Amino acid sequence: RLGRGIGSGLGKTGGRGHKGQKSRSGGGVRRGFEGGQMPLYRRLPKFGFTS
């Protein structure tokens, strides 16, 4: 139970750190986001087919 006082050890920030995307309500990047670069599953080429 985060954000329930100093003694709990998870108060006033809820374990989210300080003013990042993870600290915003509904914040955070999608799966595979690499900071702006095209992710590895897009740097690498497709191969093969499904039989």
Partner: protein
């Protein structure tokens, strides 16, 4: 709702026996002639996914 797999990643990674993922090497599409044969030969075989990117791959592939 059911989690949706990232279809772009599902077409490039196959799970292996010990839980790894294999992918084909890059840099072998259309500027390969100027690359030495030894370089091209090493890119031909399949490769293992590095440890740093394992978490990202698993996130994109929750059902495989």
């Amino acid at each position: 709702p059911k989690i949706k797999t990232v279809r772009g990643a599902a077409k490039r990674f196959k799970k292996t026996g010990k839980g790894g993922f294999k992918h084909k090497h890059a840099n072998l599409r259309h500027i390969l002639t100027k690359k030495a044969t030894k370089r091209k030969r090493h890119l031909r075989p399949k490769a293992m996914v590095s440890k740093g990117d394992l978490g990202l791959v698993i996130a994109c592939l929750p059902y495989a």
